[PDB]
Design a binder for this molecule. Structure first.
Ligand SMILES: CCCCCCCCCCCCCC(=O)O[C@H](CCCCCCCCCCC)CC(=O)O[C@@H]1[C@@H](NC(=O)C[C@@H](CCCCCCCCCCC)OC(=O)CCCCCCCCCCC)[C@H](OC[C@H]2O[C@H](OP(=O)(O)O)[C@H](NC(=O)C[C@H](O)CCCCCCCCCCC)[C@@H](OC(=O)C[C@H](O)CCCCCCCCCCC)[C@@H]2O)O[C@H](CO[C@]2(C(=O)O)C[C@@H](O[C@]3(C(=O)O)C[C@@H](O)[C@@H](O)[C@@H]([C@H](O)CO)O3)[C@@H](O[C@H]3O[C@H]([C@@H](O)CO)[C@@H](OP(=O)(O)O)[C@H](O[C@H]4O[C@H]([C@@H](O)CO[C@H]5O[C@H]([C@@H](O)CO)[C@@H](O)[C@H](O)[C@@H]5O)[C@@H](OP(=O)(O)O)[C@H](O)[C@@H]4O)[C@@H]3O)[C@@H]([C@H](O)CO)O2)[C@H]1OP(=O)(O)O
Ligand SMILES: CN1C(=O)[C@H](CCCCN)NC(=O)[C@H](CCCN)NCc2cccnc2Sc2c(Cl)ccc(-c3ccc(N)nc3)c2CNC(=O)[C@@H]1Cc1c[nH]c2ccccc12
Ligand SMILES: CCCCCCCCCCCCO[C@@H]1O[C@H](CO)[C@@H](O[C@H]2O[C@H](CO)[C@@H](O)[C@H](O)[C@H]2O)[C@H](O)[C@H]1O
Lengths: 338, 238, 316, 239
């Protein structure tokens, strides 16, 4: 079967893309209103429009889960209200096959979500921040049993006022070394000057020693764990895990990204099951209203359970994959009830 | 082929709308499922199709239990459904509507699918609109394309829902000719309709269901001369 | 009988919408507040008091929105299930049905007049004192597990943290005095099995104790002093603000005609944006008067233009 | 009183659904506005009621123009509407359904409003079910409450939309007595209905609206003998 599949996929795809265009345009206009109250002498209305316009790919990335939900509601709602889903079942097309055709439309949004996350959002985020405001300072890091503090760190391999403190398995001091400038030449060693090193008293004009800081991840320190792309996040987590402990705010960000495609498909399946179930024979406006309540309910639930994973002992995987598994099970049950 | 249906039952808001509705239908035979409005003729009809889940009952088709099957699992066994409302694929052409369901057939290859599509269009005289969108055709022309589309799935029992709905007396003969054509094609037809004057004119064996149960059975001649049907449904004069 | 029929319907579905918007508008803020509390920047035990003190602030917006939405759902239902064809067909127009709800809109105007004039400042006054009390948190209060927190001359690293923000584990403290402890219970912090270093003085120990708006002013104080544009914008926002209920009445009557097949909710999203364009205009008017660019007379003018536009559209 | 309709017209999506429809209905006379489905009999009926805005023509009630008056303004002149679908106030008592419209009347005080409600309930044999909700009644009893409610507004012309819709042959005769009673009440009745066989059995003057225009006019006997109607609407075999 191909003609039926194209009709169901194209109708839903145009509804998922049509909702995406509308939702991004509304969020750009709404964000611009909030950004219009921060104008000043050096930040004009045009400067505040580019900062919001450059943020559109990031608003786009966060709309795809809710535009796919509304898209499947409106895409299949048009088919359902026209009695087109009844005559697909009347010839032998199952409910799970019609859901599979809608998932094909959502798989375009999942691939679009990957492209924005990996290559588009991390770039326009850099451009957006440069529009408004126009290397990490006071960087505190731990490397196993050593605590390293650098006042100024640069992505090109420059340091200012380094301070490294060594400890034992019994937590006893060995050396508190301080420098004035530092340079990066190879992994696991940095060249530096004026090595005023304590010993449990010593000095050196120029000597390198071992430290695991790398300039590649310096620019990722200030970036929030949520904002980091998956390529940046996993590489950064692998770097921290090799020398220290990864914070739970990075574990949550990792799980909130690996479960992003699975929350888009699951939320589509819930939309399809509602069309065949509770939202059958309802008005198009009522389906859109309910599709907005599920979107907010899912956004609030994933926001709250994200925060709850940073305050409670269990791993963030339980809180992130919790609703996704339950909505899939509950959504697949509403499909079993036909 | 015989579609045995035994002891149907269904409740809504803790009220049994259908109570022990049982009737038998054979292939190549028109059977009218009639009765007072809201007395269970529509609900008993939908439980045969599969829209309404069966609380109690047994549906058999050639020693083959369709009771547990869903709407689509029955449709693959040879049960068709023609909705009363407009059910044409709006954005697909009339030829694409029939071709959409013809590709579902497994025992047809691409060579004979086009031949089957051509004769289905010629049978119902919708060739002149084969390239027009399903949303831009006349109600009489669209309904012929919905029946032609339903016949693309090769059904053994076509369950028509309200065929004489909004049909003028001039074109009531056209619908009867279509329904008579389905019988001559070897397809049993189950008709539920509010228009009982014309449904009792093509059906060979009618079932009158009142108060949720079958109160009469037989040919339209026997239905008319039935005291319970005359008292409850048809009235003294008819 | 027809007035009591409508008032019962509008009140019932407006209270549902108001309770539905309160759960959504402040459920989102409560979750956001919980996000701040999860990072130690706000006490987890007070974030329910913040929601209590922001009830009048959000209900200031929800009440006109709940009344507007509840009005169109009722008037949409009358159109959808053909109760308006028999009301118009009996001599009772839609404008007449909206005029039967003027006594109800006056009650909602009085209710919101209480919110805008009294509880919105009172709620914001207590919240401002409370929020400023949470901005002084520093030191071990802002600590996070497996992370370095710097607050002034203090740098604190904790290897673990309980579900409550007490009983720290693997504590590192830096000024220059460096303190490392295995356990710490909480600024007053009791350190257990720790080492103290001076940067060269070393002192091991078993236990240690470480000791490192015009929007809320009362309406009484704002009744006078109309000369100042900042007070002029705020006091006008409190006096002409409650009259959005009346505008939400004659604009919900205008934008409620819907076909039975279209649905009760068909004209919600298109017409919530028409109502929201009024509020966005009124927020854009409150700021200009605050900079002394527009004058206080523009509050009724914004309402009158929407009032006249709604009255003209309902009579087309 | 004579409701006069002249040269109705209405174009939908640049297609003239109704083209020059004109008919006259008097008080105390039952007029059936029939015709092929979708040929403009439904749209022309709605322009008379006031649901759809007129696009050409005029409507008169004893040299009193009603074309410019909205639906509610014609209702005060004595024109009623009975929707085919369930139009009862769902969560109002049946006694309150009739009473909600009786309180609209200005020429009735509390003393004689209860008397009118009591006799309206008795005239339609719903006084036994007068304490139940509008949405919790039988389909046959609900329509009797919608006609009692319609009579509470005291109309001079009642425009019935599909009175014989979803009605069993046992209960078709019950509606015939109701419509006959409305005529016996001095109220003209305009009926549009797909069930032409039963509509022609009560109306004394039927109008057949085909291709957007009135193609027939007169008693049902004259409609049946019309060769133009039997070619487009009724067919060769019809009785
Ligand atoms: C005369 C008149 C009389 C009546 C007048 C009435 C008076 C006017 C109102 C007065 C009373 C209000 C009091 C008030 O205050 O009301 C504020 C909020 C209301 C403002 C109303 C303005 C008038 C509009 C009139 C409209 C009338 C209709 C609270 C506040 O003030 O919130 C402020 C809060 N803002 C919001 O939440 C936006 C508010 C805006 C909501 C306004 C629009 C909706 C309102 C009406 C809904 C009606 C539904 C029917 O959303 C929310 O409330 C939660 C969401 C609610 C959604 C409900 C929808 C229901 C739909 C149901 C289905 C049908 C803000 O958040 C920060 C960011 O968080 C997320 O981003 P991040 O995730 O971090 O990236 C948000 N991302 C987001 O939301 C979006 C997320 O990415 C998710 C994306 C996916 C969803 C969106 C996709 C689709 C969008 C479009 C859909 C249509 C970003 O949103 C933004 O960027 C802007 C962005 O356009 C927001 C989203 C788009 C608009 C929202 C539409 C939602 C629609 C849903 C479907 C319809 C936002 O920037 O932090 C401030 C403090 O932060 C700071 C500081 O800067 O000071 C810095 C902090 O660091 C920290 O330090 C903090 C410190 O703790 C205290 O200082 O301080 C808070 O202020 P503060 O508390 O005062 O300090
Ligand atoms: C800067 N403002 C605030 O501080 C209010 C105060 C919140 C309620 C306090 N009780 N918060 C916010 O903006 C937070 C984000 C800020 C995070 N700190 N969320 C958004 C928001 C909420 C509430 C109202 N509008 C808005 S967004 C807005 C809108 Cl919808 C429409 C127009 C404008 C605007 C006006 C003039 C101008 N040239 N460009 C733009 C804006 C910008 N917003 C503003 O101008 C307002 C002005 C204002 C001060 N007191 C008010 C009391 C009621 C209504 C408005 C105000
Ligand atoms: C259903 C909707 C009906 C129509 C509603 C139209 C109005 C919608 C509300 C507009 C809300 C504006 O939302 C507002 O977005 C701005 C972004 O500029 C956020 O602003 C926040 O982040 C920006 C940059 O990210 C900072 O410059 C700013 O200082 C900070 O407050 C506000 O915290 C938020 O309140």
């Amino acid at each position: 079967r191909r003609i039926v599949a194209k009709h169901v996929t194209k109708t839903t795809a145009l509804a998922m893309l049509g909702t995406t265009i509308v939702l991004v345009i509304l969020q750009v206009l709404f964000t611009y209103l909030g950004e219009l109250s921060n104008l000043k002498a050096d930040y004009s209305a045009w400067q505040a429009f580019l900062y919001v316009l450059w943020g559109a790919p990031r608003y786009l990335y966060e709309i795809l889960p809710i535009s796919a939900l509304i898209g499947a509601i409106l895409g299949l709602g048009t088919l359902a209200s026209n009695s087109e889903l009844i005559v697909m079942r009347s010839v032998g097309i199952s409910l799970w096959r019609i859901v599979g055709w809608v998932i094909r439309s959502a798989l375009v949004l999942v691939l679009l979500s990957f492209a924005l996350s990996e290559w588009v959002v991390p770039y326009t985020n850099e451009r957006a921040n440069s529009v408004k405001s126009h290397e990490v300072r006071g960087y505190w890091s731990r490397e196993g049993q050593r605590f390293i503090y650098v006042d100024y760190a640069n992505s090109q391999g420059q340091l200012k006022r380094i301070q490294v403190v060594d400890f034992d398995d019994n937590y006893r001091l060995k050396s508190v070394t301080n420098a004035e400038q530092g340079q990066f030449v190879k992994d696991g060693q940095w060249l530096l000057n004026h090595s005023q090193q304590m010993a449990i008293l010593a000095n050196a004009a120029k000597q390198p020693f071992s430290l695991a800081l790398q300039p590649k991840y310096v620019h990722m320190v200030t970036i929030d764990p949520e904002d980091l792309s998956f390529s940046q996040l996993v590489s950064f987590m692998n770097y921290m895990r090799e020398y220290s402990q990864v914070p739970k705010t990075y574990q949550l960000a990792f799980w909130k990204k690996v479960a992003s495609p699975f929350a888009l498909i699951t939320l589509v399946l819930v939309a399809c099951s509602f069309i065949f179930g509770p939202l059958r024979q309802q008005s198009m406006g009522f389906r859109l209203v309910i599709a907005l309540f599920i979107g907010l309910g899912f956004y609030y639930l994933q926001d709250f359970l994200g925060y709850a994973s940073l305050v409670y002992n269990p791993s963030p995987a339980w809180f992130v994959l919790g609703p996704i598994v339950l909505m899939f099970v509950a959504g697949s049950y509403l499909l079993y009830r036909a | 082929q015989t579609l045995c249906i035994k002891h149907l039952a269904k409740n809504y808001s803790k009220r049994w709308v259908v109570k022990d509705v049982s009737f038998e239908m054979q292939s190549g035979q028109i059977v009218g499922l009639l009765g007072p409005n809201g007395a269970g003729k529509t609900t008993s009809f939908y439980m045969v199709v599969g829209l309404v889940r069966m609380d109690k009952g047994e549906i058999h088709l050639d020693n083959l239990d369709l009771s547990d099957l869903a709407m689509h699992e029955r449709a693959r066994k040879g049960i068709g459904y023609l909705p009363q409302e407009a059910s044409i694929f709006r954005k697909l052409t009339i030829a694409e509507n029939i071709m959409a369901i013809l590709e579902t057939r497994k025992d047809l290859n691409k060579q004979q699918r086009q031949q089957r599509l051509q004769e289905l269009l010629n049978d119902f005289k919708i060739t002149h609109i084969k390239d027009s969108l399903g949303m831009s055709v006349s109600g009489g022309e669209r309904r012929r394309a919905e029946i032609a589309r339903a016949l693309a799935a090769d059904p053994k029992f076509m369950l028509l829902d309200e065929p004489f709905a909004g049909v003028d007396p001039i074109s009531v003969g056209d619908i009867k000719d279509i329904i008579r054509n389905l019988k001559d094609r070897g397809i049993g037809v189950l008709i539920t309709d509010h228009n009982v004057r014309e449904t009792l004119a093509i059906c060979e064996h009618a079932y009158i269901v009142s108060e949720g149960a079958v109160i009469a059975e037989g040919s339209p001649q026997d239905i008319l001369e039935n005291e319970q049907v005359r008292k409850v449904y048809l009235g003294d004069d008819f | 009988i027809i007035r009591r029929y409508l008032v019962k319907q509008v009140v019932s579905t407006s209270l549902v919408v108001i309770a539905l918007l309160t759960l959504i508008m402040m459920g989102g803020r409560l979750i956001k507040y919980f996000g701040v509390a999860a990072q130690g920047r706000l006490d987890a035990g007070v974030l329910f008091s913040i929601i209590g003190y922001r009830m009048p602030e959000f209900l200031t917006l929800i009440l006109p929105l709940g009344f507007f939405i509840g009005l169109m759902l009722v008037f949409g239902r009358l159109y959808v299930d053909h109760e308006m064809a028999v009301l118009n067909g009996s001599g009772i127009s839609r404008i007449r049905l909206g005029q039967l709800l003027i006594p109800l809109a006056l009650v909602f105007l009085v209710i919101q007049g209480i919110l805008m004039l009294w509880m919105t400042p009172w709620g914001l006054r207590q919240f401002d004192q409370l929020s400023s009390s949470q901005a002084v948190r520093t030191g071990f209060d802002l600590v996070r597990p497996k992370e370095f927190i710097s607050s002034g001359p203090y740098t604190i690293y904790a290897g673990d943290l309980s579900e409550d923000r007490k009983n720290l584990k693997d504590i590192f403290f830096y000024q220059d005095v460096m303190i490392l402890a295995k356990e710490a219970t909480r600024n007053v912090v009791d350190l257990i099995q720790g080492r103290r270093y001076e940067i060269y003085s070393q002192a091991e120990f078993q236990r240690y104790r470480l000791r490192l708006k015009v929007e809320a002013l009362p309406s009484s104080k704002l009744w006078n002093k109309w000369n100042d544009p900042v007070i002029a914008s705020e006091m006008g926002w409190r006096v002409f603000g409650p009259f959005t209920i009346v505008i939400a009445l004659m604009m919900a009557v205008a934008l409620c005609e819907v076909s039975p097949r279209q649905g009760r909710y068909y004209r919600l999203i298109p017409a919530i944006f028409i109502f929201a364009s009024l509020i966005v205009l009124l927020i854009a008017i409150r700021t200009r008067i605050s900079r002394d660019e527009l004058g206080v007379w523009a509050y009724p003018a914004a309402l009158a233009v929407y009032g006249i536009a709604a009255a003209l559209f309902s009579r087309k």
